Design a protein around this nucleic acid. Structure first.
Lengths: 15, 420
DNA sequence: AATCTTTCCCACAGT
DNA sequence: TTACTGTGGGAAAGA
C-alpha cells in the first residue's frame, strides 16, 4: 500500500 | 500578570510565523548496564532547536538587557527520572547537540522510560521540560529467533531506523549511516533516520516504488530512504550476520540491535560497506562448504535500531510568560463529526488541557476539553473569514492553532479548508 | 523446552 | 613505554 519517489545514490566499487 | 491572546496579537503572529521548535531524535529501545558498566545509548539522542523563533527571542532578550551569555538557551538531558543525574548539552553556537554519555542501570526497574530535556536561558528564565517518545529497556538483543508476539522489538515497514558500525568492540570506531553534502557517508558524529520500506521480491529498481505493509524479515527486499534529504540507496536484501558471515537461508523477523548485512540486489555478492567515512560496495567471498553463507567485510556488518522523533512547537503570543511552555500539546490528526448538528472538529493528540482554545486563523472557536488526547471545537461560520459570505463561495484554507489562557501559541502545521 | 536476564570476562583503545 | 581503567561483544550461568 503506497508509492514512494526517492532518488537512488549508487555506492561505488574501488580501483 | 498573565494575559489572554487578542486577535491583534494572533494576527501579528500569523504575519511572521516565528515559532520555537524543540526536536528530540532518539532510538525506540535501550540496552541496560549492570556492574558499574556504562553501556551508552547508540545512536546518541539529539536535541535540535529549530525555527525562526530562537533568533527572534535572542533579539528580544538582548534588547531588554541580556548579554549573549544570558540569551543563550541551555539544555540538560536525563531519564525519567532516576536520582537526578542530568548531563549538560552544549548548544553554544550550534542548533543541535547529541547526548553522547547516557545509559540505564539494572537498578532502574522501569520496563519503559522517556528522556527529559530541561530547558532554560542563561539568565535562568525557564523554557520547560520536553519528553522524548517511549523508550523500551532491553536486557540485550535476542541471540536466537524472534516472534511477532513481542512486535515491540520487530521492525515495521515504513518506520525509521538508524544503522551503525563498530570495529573491535570500540566505542571510538562508531560510525553511522548518514547523508550529507549530497552523499551517503559513515559519520562518527552525526546519524540519519532511514525509513525502511518493504518491496515485493518481483519489484524492479528505480526512483519510484511500491511499498508493502508488514514486519521486516531477513531475506526480504527493502528500501532505505533518508527521512531528511529524501535520498535512497539501491534495492537491498536485509541479511542476518552470524559473525563475519551473512546467512542467506534466514527468514526470521529482523529485531532491534541485531547485526545486518545489506546485499545490493542483482550484484555479484556486493554488500553496503564502510571504508573510513566512505560508503562503498564490497564483494563477499562465499563459504566453501556452505551455499547459504558468505564471508563479509568487518565494515559490512550494521546494527539496526528503530528510531523515533518528538516535536514541540511554541510561541510567546502575549510575550514572555510565568508558567513553562511545556507540556506542549501535539495534534496528531483532525476529523469532522461531521456532519451531525453543527460542524465540529475533533482533535487527536497528546498534552491537551482544559485551559487550551482552538483557533482557525485569527478566529477563536468554542472549545471543549475531553481528555489529554481529545478535544472538540465548533468550526466558525465562513462569514468570520470573508465578510457577508452567505455560503462558502470558493475554497478558504485556514490554520488550526491551539492557544493557551496565558498567551502561548502552539501551531499544528494542520489547516482547515472550507469547500462548497 | 527454550526463552530472556544477569553475570562474567577478554579485547583493544583512552588515562 | 608501561600498568590502570573502561566500553562493548560474546558466551556462560541463572531466572
Amino acid at each position: 500500500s503506497g508509492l514512494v519517489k526517492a532518488p537512488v545514490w549508487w555506492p561505488m566499487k574501488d580501483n | 500578570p498573565p494575559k489572554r491572546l487578542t486577535r491583534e496579537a494572533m494576527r501579528n503572529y500569523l504575519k511572521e510565523r516565528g515559532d520555537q521548535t524543540v526536536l528530540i531524535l532518539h532510538a525506540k529501545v535501550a540496552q541496560k548496564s549492570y556492574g558499574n558498566e556504562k553501556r551508552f545509548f547508540c545512536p546518541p539522542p539529539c536535541v535540535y532547536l529549530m525555527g525562526s523563533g530562537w533568533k527572534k527571542k535572542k533579539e528580544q532578550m538582548e534588547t531588554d538587557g541580556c548579554s549573549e551569555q544570558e540569551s543563550q538557551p541551555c539544555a540538560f538531558i536525563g531519564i525519567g527520572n532516576s536520582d537526578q543525574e542530568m548531563q549538560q548539552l552544549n548548544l553554544e553556537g550550534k542548533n543541535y547537540c547529541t547526548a553522547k554519555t547516557l545509559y540505564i542501570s539494572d537498578s532502574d526497574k522501569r520496563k519503559h522510560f522517556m528522556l527529559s530535556v530541561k530547558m532554560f536561558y542563561g539568565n535562568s528564565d525557564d523554557i520547560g521540560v520536553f519528553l522524548s517518545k517511549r523508550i523500551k529497556v532491553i536486557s540485550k538483543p535476542s541471540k536466537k529467533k524472534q516472534s511477532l508476539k513481542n512486535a515491540d522489538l520487530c521492525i515495521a515497514s515504513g518506520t525509521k531506523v538508524a544503522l551503525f558500525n563498530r570495529l573491535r568492540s570500540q566505542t571510538v570506531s562508531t560510525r553511522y549511516l548518514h547523508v550529507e553534502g549530497g552523499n551517503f557517508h559513515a559519520s562518527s558524529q552525526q546519524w540519519g533516520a532511514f525509513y525502511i520500506h518493504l518491496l515485493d521480491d518481483d519489484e524492479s529498481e528505480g526512483e519510484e516504488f511500491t511499498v508493502r505493509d508488514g514486519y521486516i524479515h531477513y531475506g526480504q527486499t527493502v528500501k532505505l530512504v533518508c527521512s531528511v534529504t529524501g535520498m535512497a540507496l539501491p534495492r537491498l536484501i536485509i541479511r542476518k550476520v552470524d559473525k563475519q558471515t551473512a546467512l542467506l537461508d534466514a527468514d526470521d523477523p529482523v529485531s532491534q540491535l541485531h547485526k545486518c548485512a545489506f546485499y545490493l540486489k542483482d550484484t555479484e555478492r556486493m554488500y553496503l560497506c564502510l571504508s573510513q567515512e566512505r560508503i562503498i560496495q564490497f564483494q563477499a567471498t562465499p563459504c566453501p562448504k556452505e551455499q547459504n553463507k558468505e564471508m563479509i567485510n568487518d565494515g559490512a556488518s550494521w546494527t539496526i535500531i528503530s528510531t523515533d522523533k518528538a516535536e514541540y512547537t511554541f510561541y510567546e503570543g502575549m510575550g514572555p510568560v510565568l508558567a513553562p511552555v511545556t507540556p506542549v500539546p501535539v495534534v496528531e490528526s483532525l476529523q469532522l463529526n461531521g456532519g451531525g448538528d453543527v460542524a465540529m472538529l475533533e482533535l487527536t493528540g497528546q498534552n491537551f488541557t482544559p485551559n487550551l482554545r482552538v483557533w482557525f486563523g485569527d478566529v477563536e472557536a468554542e472549545t471543549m476539553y475531553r481528555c489529554g488526547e481529545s478535544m472538540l471545537c465548533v468550526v466558525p461560520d465562513i462569514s468570520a473569514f470573508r465578510e457577508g459570505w452567505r455560503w462558502v463561495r470558493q475554497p478558504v484554507q485556514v490554520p488550526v492553532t491551539l492557544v493557551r489562557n496565558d498567551g502561548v501559541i502552539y501551531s499544528t502545521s494542520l489547516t482547515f479548508t472550507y469547500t462548497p
